[PDB]
Design a binder for this molecule. Sequence first.
Ligand SMILES: *[C@@H]1O[C@H](CO)[C@@H](O)[C@H](O)[C@H]1NC(C)=O
Ligand SMILES: *[C@@H]1O[C@H](CO)[C@@H](O)[C@H](O)[C@H]1NC(C)=O
Lengths: 492, 492
Amino acid sequence: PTAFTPNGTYLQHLARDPTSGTLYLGATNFLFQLSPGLQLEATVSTGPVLDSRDCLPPVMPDECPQAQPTNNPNQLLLVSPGALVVCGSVHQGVCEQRRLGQLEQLLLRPERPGDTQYVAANDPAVSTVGLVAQGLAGEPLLFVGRGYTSVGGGIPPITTRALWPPDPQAAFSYEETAKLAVGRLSEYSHHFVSAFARGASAYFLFLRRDLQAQSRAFRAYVSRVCLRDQHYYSYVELPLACEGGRYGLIQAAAVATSREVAHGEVLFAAFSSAAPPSAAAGASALCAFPLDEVDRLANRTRDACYTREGRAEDGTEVAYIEYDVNSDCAQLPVDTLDAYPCGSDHTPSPMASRVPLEATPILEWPGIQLTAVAVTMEDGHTIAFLGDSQGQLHRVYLGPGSDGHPYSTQSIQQGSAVSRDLTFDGTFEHLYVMTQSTLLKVPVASCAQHLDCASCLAHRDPYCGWCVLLGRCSRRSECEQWLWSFQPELGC
Amino acid sequence: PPTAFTPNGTYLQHLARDPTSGTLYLGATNFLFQLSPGLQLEATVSTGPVLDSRDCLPPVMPDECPQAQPTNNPNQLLLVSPGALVVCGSVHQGVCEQRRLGQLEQLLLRPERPGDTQYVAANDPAVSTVGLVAQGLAGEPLLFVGRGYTSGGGIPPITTRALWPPDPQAAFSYEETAKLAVGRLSEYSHHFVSAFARGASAYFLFLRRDLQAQSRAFRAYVSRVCLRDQHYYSYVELPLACEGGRYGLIQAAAVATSREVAHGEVLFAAFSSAAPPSAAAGASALCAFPLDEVDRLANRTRDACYTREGRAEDGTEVAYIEYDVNSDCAQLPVDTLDAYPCGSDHTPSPMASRVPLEATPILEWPGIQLTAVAVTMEDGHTIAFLGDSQGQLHRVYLGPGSDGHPYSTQSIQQGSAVSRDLTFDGTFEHLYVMTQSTLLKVPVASCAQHLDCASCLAHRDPYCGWCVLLGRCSRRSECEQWLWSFQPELGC
Ligand SMILES: *[C@@H]1O[C@H](CO)[C@@H](O)[C@H](O)[C@H]1NC(C)=O
Ligand SMILES: *[C@@H]1O[C@H](CO)[C@@H](O)[C@H](O)[C@H]1NC(C)=O
């Protein structure tokens, strides 16, 4: 397969322009721009740089003597409509903007940024996530979820930051209210896995300590805010549960449309089991949460807390206000739900559900730590692409007939985890896979190398069958008119 | 096996369940807990240790309380009212506070400097405190409180107390007349067992020393008072007799509507025999007093004392004034009963019957000290769950067919008494059972773990039987043809 293996660096993040298909790659001291065929369109160096976590940028040796040279693994890498957003691990995680298609060309780098323009975690271990969307002021906003770091200030775990503000020197700053107001950051230890949009709703997947549970164990959550408000009124926090927390550490996730799973888009999540913040080598599972059910529970958490003091019509306590913020649920008129579906400066917030969103595992893999999810539907049925901590990429048919073991496994790079940033190309014919030292372009389905029916059906791959009338080892859509290679009792 | 809650380094005093939400509030040593209907911890509040002497008045500051010690705070009173949770501790003269139903952490009202008229619960952890939430004439929240004697002082045994006066800082106080005026509190030695309401009436269950008897012995009594009446004019005590005082000491009770026992509500009360103060380790009985017969005798006791100087038509003192109070039965015109059925500032008070309200044991178990009662009617016939002093929960069928021995018994916690806060859930599907160190959620029936008819019928449980259609071990409702597992002569 086609590869990109830059020497002298490690790969942190992969961002694909959905309009152009250009790939941008965020590595240690390098950004890359790649053709959709992994041809190198451009290269930008970003480090090492003189830095100390105690000094504030711009880091000069005069007012930062403790400075030492410091490598710069990539923290945020995002395709905004206007530009490419790049945030690093160095200089308190400040960000810059580069020309989409001309990585080499820098659009904007605040010259002397403030305590409010430190964006990413300035620790490459800690993890930063991000989403871009159009704001009500006309210009595009950048949501950022941010793990905890022990330096500078205490940055909020989620923030909504301006990318194209009036003064461009203020870009990446957030209005005083554009944040989740969370104290005790060190205690919650937010660990972000992913952020995504759909409809008017932004979603964040993350881990955080349950401070009311007896163990103060970590616990997986999905929270939803409205895409458009700079503010965090609509913020609703749901706990996630894959088999009621046997697999309690969400590792990666992907959205996809599948019809036999549920109507609407569906969130496929990979949870591991804990040994304390990380997985144990321990088992993994893949759960699916239909977003229309994510919205329905989140919707009825809002509806309870706005109009029924946090109770269902059943009478049950379902909703409350998390993070010890001074705010309780209310008995506002039901007209409120229509007038202000995303809240006001005076509605309850931040809202959380007492009811967990629960899913029974689609598959349960005993020895594996899943790190990466990619899901598509082919000729009616789900096929998952799953990467693990050991650099393997598993392909799993999930339709009828399957005990859900990988029909195919493949070693991208032994002993090095596959990235959540695992993404398909535009036609869905290929999947870009990335470990820490290589990025591969992998074909979903290599059917047509087979030039005889018996070779076709021996490939044994849900994508492949023998089109009888055309003498072709093809995919069903490309047609005894198609002899599926994934039905062993059958043959030529 | 049950779902449980076992908090470390604490003991459980009371459990109060919210009849609308089903959420459970626990009251413990230095702790409040809030738990889902499934016993998941939703919140925890510390209530101690505190600085305190029984000699000081709250708020205890060291500049006014030199003798203050670290003092633990076992819970004394835990009641869901309409707006808040009422909480009263054993410290700070037993003062009370209120907290948000559904967010216990959030507090609603805690008088800043309270008076001699606002020391509510017994400021000694070994003394009884019972309470009942009612509404006054103007439909505002009231709190009847019964408390045992405690060696500042003079707190009346029963008092009506305002949960939300005009002036929030006046909460939990009581108007000068809103009290049962007892002189010799040390001698009467009220031990309150329970308070409950039904109809227009509030009822209290307690022990007191009978000082008109030669024995001066402790005797079990039930007293009734009109809910509207906040001045205790209408107060009237009936002695309770379970096999003529063989079983002297009432221990726990629970009301239930049962078809085969009487019309209306019926009080199922567990009495124990006195040790030749408290129970011997002895024998217990379960006696049933229909509330309609309580009201009848209390009504005849009122009538006989208003209009016939306490005598019946044949001429016998059947009613008299108790508690060496200066008041006598009168020969008031008969129309006084219609004009003043709950008494006056000028009518006889407080009233007692000379005639005991009598009942004969539903069951008598020698060698068991019963401590907790819950009764339900299942398919027309009474079932009683009874806890005891050794943390054992006995299940008893009382329909036709039994010598009244338990068809099932479990250890909740060996040798630690089951609390009289034994209480069903909302579907009467489960039972919340608590000893001093654990809380359990017990299903009433474990029918369906049964696969074959043999096994089903071998459970020998009045709840379980074999639905012959459907082919599963169900309950008579979830069928209609059904083979009862509590009829041994019947097989399949
Ligand atoms: C959630 O609520 C929004 C607005 O209040 C509505 O547009 C949407 O249909 C709801 N989604 C559900 C009920 O799944
Ligand atoms: C007791 O008396 C009241 C009024 O005096 C009456 O309404 C009630 O029904 C009576 N209860 C009885 C007789 O059981």
